[PDB]
């Protein structure tokens, strides 16, 4: 399953992320890609030799906007650094 927040383990690798198709071209021997921080970002699907990106599932801080409760109880919520779809 692709383009969806799914917990996955490839070849028993494990992890949670969003599986997307990748334009990056692995060399034939390689199986696992890694990032600058040596964090797994790309994998080669075992059954079908397809190169999948790992994008970590979205997350961010939740900030609450409020005027003083002395004035009112209405409140507005700020979801940080997320597009207005994941909510």
């Amino acid at each position: 399953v692709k383009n969806k927040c799914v917990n996955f383990n490839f070849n028993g690798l494990t992890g949670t992320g969003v599986l997307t198709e990748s334009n990056k071209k692995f060399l034939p021997f390689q199986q696992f890609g890694r990032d600058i921080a040596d964090t797994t970002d790309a994998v080669r699907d075992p059954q079908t030799l397809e190169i999948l990106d790992i994008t970590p599932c979205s997350f961010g801080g939740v900030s609450v906007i409020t005027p003083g409760t002395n004035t009112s109880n209405q409140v507005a919520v700020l979801y940080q650094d997320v597009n207005c779809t994941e909510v």
């Binding site: 990056k24 692995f26 060399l27 021997f29 390689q30 199986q31 696992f32 890609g33 890694r34 990032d35 600058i36 790309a42």
Partner: peptide, 23 residues
């Protein structure tokens, strides 16, 4: 006889795909 192994000899140590990364 002897000669100079100027730069030859580096091999991909493992199974990775670092891109523009100094490892």
């Amino acid at each position: 006889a002897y000669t100079n192994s100027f730069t030859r000899g580096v091999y991909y140590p493992d199974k990775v795909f670092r891109s523009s990364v100094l490892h």
